[PDB]
Structure formats: C-alpha cells, structure tokens
Design a protein around this ligand. Structure first.
Ligand SMILES: [Mn+2]
Ligand SMILES: [Mn+2]
Ligand SMILES: [Mn+2]
Ligand SMILES: [Mn+2]
Ligand SMILES: [Mn+2]
Ligand SMILES: [Mn+2]
Ligand SMILES: [Mn+2]
Ligand SMILES: [Mn+2]
Ligand SMILES: [Mn+2]
Ligand code: NA
Length: 325
DNA sequence: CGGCCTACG
DNA sequence: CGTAG
DNA sequence: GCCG
C-alpha cells in the first residue's frame, strides 16, 4: 500500500465503508476543533481502507498500512470486536459536533464562523435567521436556499444544467467548451453541486468570458445568487411545474492551463491535496490548478492532457473514477 | 520538531 | 474569512 | 495523528 493517495487507485465502490465512515467522523470532529493535522491523518487512514481489495475482518490486516497508528488502529479494533467505537459514538451524539455539522454545511459558513456562533449560544438555523445582520450576503443566500441545497443533485439535474450552461457559453463565445468536472466526472451518481470547466481552443479568447456567461444566465432568470475566473453560483433550476435551487461552480481557464484545471477540479479533494504534497515533497515541483512549476529552472511544464501531468510527476496514470480518495 | 495543498472571491 | 477540488 |  503506497503512502500517498495519488499513488493508488481508489474506486467509488469499496469494501470498508463502516470503518472508513467512522474514521471520517473523527476527522470531521478534529476539523471542528481546529486540528487540521489530525483531520488529515484520519482522512488518510479512511482513504487507505477504501483502496483495499477486500473487507478488513481482523486487526492483523492493518499491520504495516500507512497512516495507521495507535489511535486509528484502536478505532478499527473496537468496531471489529464490538460493532461500535465509544469515541465515535460520543462525538456523534455531542451537541457540539451536531451543531458544528449543521452550521458548516451552510454555504458561506466555515469552521471559524460556526465555532463563534456556537460559543455565542446559537444552535439552530432558526437562531441564525433571527439575527440576519450577523450574516454576509453569501451566508444569507446559503440559508435562504438551505433546504434545496440539502437535496442530492442527480444526473438528470446535471444534464439539464450542462445544457443551459452550454447555451450561455455558446452565446458568449463561439467555439468555447464546457466540461463536467467534480464528483460527477469521477462517476458519482449524486452530489452537493455541479462543477463545470470552460475554455476555448484559442489561447486568450476566453478572457472576459465568465462575466458574459453570467450576464446571459441571469437574463434568462437562471441565477439566484452569484459573486473573475471562478463563480460559485446558486441556479434556479426548472423542474416540472416549479424549480429548485442548485449549487453550480463555473470556472474558466485558458487552454494552456486546461489539463491542470481539469485535474484539480476533478478531485477528489484528498486526492488533489495528496497529489500536490507528492509533487512538492517527492519531486520538488509546485502543482496547482494553473500549472506545474519547476522552481529551480523557473519554468512551467507544458501539458496537453492529465496523462502528461501524471507522467511528469512519475506517477501511474489514474482515470477519474479511480481518484475517489 | 514541525508539516500537513494551494489557489481565487 | 469564505469558496474550490 | 501520523511521519519525515
Ligand atoms: Mn473492489
Ligand atoms: Mn490518541
Ligand atoms: Mn473491547
Ligand atoms: Mn462538486
Ligand atoms: Mn463545487
Ligand atoms: Mn488565474
Ligand atoms: Mn509537534
Ligand atoms: Mn468538494
Ligand atoms: Mn499532534
Ligand atoms: Na460551509
């Protein structure tokens, strides 16, 4: 088992859901308490279990696995022996965990904001709504549309959204393209949002595109919230006789950067953090959604495909459906 | 000991 | 700070 | 929390 998540395939369907979900609770709780390092270890340990070929049945099967130490091993041991882990159950039932989960799921609210509200005694969405001057415009939109945004986005929604985005993009710039990214490109059947990457084959023609696309969508009445090259939107998606709010991310990249943007925006989140860590720590190259930089030569790697990027980092290529770390 | 991804809005 | 994967 |  390789130590970095970008070194191993991780399929969407795997064999250790119970164990990985428990470790991910502890990771989320670590985040709520402000420990990104513990969050990362628990995330990495959960991800190792997703890459295994079979269910873990006995603690022996963990020996030698990366990111399993005393704490993560004890969690698995309790789950294997007893079906539950006392620490996980205590976290699950705590008012702090439940409220932090409730607040951070709001679009516009992260851990630091949620933690302040918790310390101020707030506990419910109705508490937040009763104090609206304490909200940014982004948070007001997230709260306004919270019910819809909690409803899974389905493939039929993706297809309808891709059609309307393609229509606006084509009106704004002939020849521009729209690529579905995010979890749906990795094969997920559902999601919390839909992610799209927009480019044009002639370098530079995409300058100024995203404001033109947004203007065209807003004039068709499709935009409930927005506000460049990244737009984190809420769309008014038509449904039979009605509509529902859906989170949509729109990203524009020049074609020179498209493989890097496609790689970054396809995820998973852990896969990309691990890939960027690997690049810098193991290869001495700096990776982001714009490029891959050699800081000694002060040059950027020219990539035509995601495969090119994997090759330049010395990694076996993984298709999107194996990046579900 | 000290790192832990790296951007844009 | 929030967002993103 | 784990590891370089
Ligand atoms: Mn399998
Ligand atoms: Mn411990
Ligand atoms: Mn026991
Ligand atoms: Mn997404
Ligand atoms: Mn998104
Ligand atoms: Mn840019
Ligand atoms: Mn330390
Ligand atoms: Mn994400
Ligand atoms: Mn520690
Ligand atoms: Na949030």
């Amino acid at each position: 088992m390789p130590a970095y998540a970008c070194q191993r395939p991780t399929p969407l369907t795997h064999h250790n859901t119970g164990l990985s979900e428990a470790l991910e609770i502890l990771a989320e709780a670590a985040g709520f308490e402000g420990s990104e390092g513990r969050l990362l270890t628990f995330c990495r340990a959960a991800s190792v279990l997703k890459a295994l070929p079979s269910p873990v049945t006995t603690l022996s099967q963990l020996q030698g696995l990366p990111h399993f130490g005393e704490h993560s091993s004890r969690v698995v041991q309790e789950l294997l022996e007893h079906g539950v882990c006392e620490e996980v159950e205590r976290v699950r039932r705590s008012e702090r965990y439940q409220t932090m989960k409730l607040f951070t799921q709001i679009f516009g609210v992260g851990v630091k904001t949620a933690d302040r509200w918790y310390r101020e005694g707030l506990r419910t969405l109705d508490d937040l709504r009763e104090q609206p001057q304490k909200l940014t415009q982004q948070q007001k939109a997230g709260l306004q549309h919270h019910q819809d945004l909690s409803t899974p986005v389905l493939r039929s929604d993706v297809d309808a959204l891709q059609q309307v985005v393609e229509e606006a993009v084509g009106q704004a710039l002939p020849g521009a393209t729209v690529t579905l990214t995010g979890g749906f490109r990795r094969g997920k059947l559902q999601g919390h949002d839909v992610d799209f990457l927009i480019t044009h084959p002639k370098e530079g023609q995409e300058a100024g595109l995203l404001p033109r696309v947004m203007c065209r969508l807003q004039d068709q009445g499709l935009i409930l919230y927005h506000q460049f090259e990244r737009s984190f939107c809420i769309f008014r998606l038509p449904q039979p006789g009605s509509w529902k709010a859906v989170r949509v991310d729109l990203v524009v990249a020049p074609v020179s950067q498209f493989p890097f943007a496609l790689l970054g925006w396809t995820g998973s989140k852990l896969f990309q953090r691990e890939l960027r860590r690997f690049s810098r720590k193991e290869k001495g190259l700096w990776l982001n959604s714009h490029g891959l930089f050699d800081p000694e030569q002060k040059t950027f790697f020219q990539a035509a495909s995601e495969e090119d990027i994997f090759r330049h980092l010395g990694l076996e290529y993984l298709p999107p459906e194996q990046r579900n770390a």
